[PDB]
Design a protein around this ligand. Structure first.
Ligand SMILES: CCCCCC/C=C/CCCC(=O)O
Ligand SMILES: [K+]
Ligand SMILES: [Zn+2]
Length: 300
């Protein structure tokens, strides 16, 4: 009964100008600004992380990989990232891992924590890929598991792309369940999640949401989570420049509402919400979709 509805995590140093790169790495500050500009949401508490500890990074990542990451070294461990490797990028990723860990800690007092940052679901123990250098949700999961050895974690991954890093890290862990709905013909090389729904180009709201509702029933038939990481990507949007799925703004809202309501129906459960991707042709649509997720989870 102590639980408050929703808190936010953010750090302004997440934001980077990546120049011509496809990834809108300044989305975070504008999602944050839309929150600040809203008279309802501007009343939520915002928490700021410190840099994640290297010892915590090591719960998921190999020392060889961390050596290459921190030294800005170009090797097989870093060269598949599809991103530059600069001190600013290192700094932004280590802060964001700190943010996702903080979000998970905040789930002790909030039903929902929306992290305006993170969702690095392609990051592997020994190699970066898919614009992801460190695995924020995997690291936070390992910490949560040390705190609560009996508790269970569900990843609901509704970003356009499979959460392969998470599927791989948790493939032999019975206390973690990975669920993903993703476009099948895109990056990445597919791992075996606990439940994968392979989507075809052109899927619309009705079919997508039907598959989601069915999938959540399937999950709960097999698995009762205490903590959920909801990877609430913006990239299934019909206007996305990378994806070919055709979810509307209202479809993405309904998606978020379905996940929200699934959590509400499980009394002990808490949710950390992570934005992951989004490549709308209009940058402002990406921002708007993430803002809409916050508004959904914050709703009366
Ligand atoms: C903040 C600067 C660094 C770029 C952050 C990249 C985050 C990638 C997230 C997942 C990609 C996707 O699933 O579409
Ligand atoms: K996904
Ligand atoms: Zn994505």
């Amino acid at each position: 009964k102590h639980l408050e509805r929703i808190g936010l995590v953010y750090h302004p140093d997440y934001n980077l100008d990546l120049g011509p790169h496809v990834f809108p790495a300044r989305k975070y500050q504008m999602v944050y600004d839309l929150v600040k500009r809203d008279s309802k949401l501007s009343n939520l508490y915002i928490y700021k992380p410190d840099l994640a500890k290297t010892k915590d990074l090591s719960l998921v990542h190999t020392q060889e990989f961390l050596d290459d990451f921190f030294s800005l070294n170009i090797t097989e461990r870093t060269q598949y990232s599809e991103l530059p490797l600069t001190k600013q990028i290192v700094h932004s990723f280590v802060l964001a891992v700190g943010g996702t860990i903080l979000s998970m800690e905040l789930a002790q007092k909030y039903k929902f924590v929306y992290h305006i940052g993170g969702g690095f679901h392609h990051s592997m123990p020994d190699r970066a890929e898919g614009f992801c250098y460190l695995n924020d949700a995997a690291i936070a999961s390992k910490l949560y598991q040390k705190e609560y050895p009996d508790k269970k974690i569900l990843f609901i991954d509704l970003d356009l792309h499979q959460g392969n890093g998470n599927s791989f890290i948790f493939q032999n862990d019975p206390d973690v369940f990975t669920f993903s709905m993703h476009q099948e013909n895109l990056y990445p090389k597919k791992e075996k999640s606990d439940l994968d729904i392979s989507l075809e180009e052109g899927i619309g709201d009705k079919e997508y949401l039907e598959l989601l509702e069915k999938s959540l029933r399937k999950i709960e038939s097999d698995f009762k989570p205490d903590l959920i990481f909801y990877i609430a990507g913006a990239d299934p949007f019909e206007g996305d420049s990378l994806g070919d799925l055709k979810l509307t703004f209202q479809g993405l809202r309904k998606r978020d509402q379905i996940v929200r309501d699934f959590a509400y129906s499980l009394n002990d459960t808490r949710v950390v919400i992570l934005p992951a991707g989004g490549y709308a042709k209009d940058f402002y649509d990406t921002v708007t979709i993430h803002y809409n997720t916050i508004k959904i989870f914050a709703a009366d």
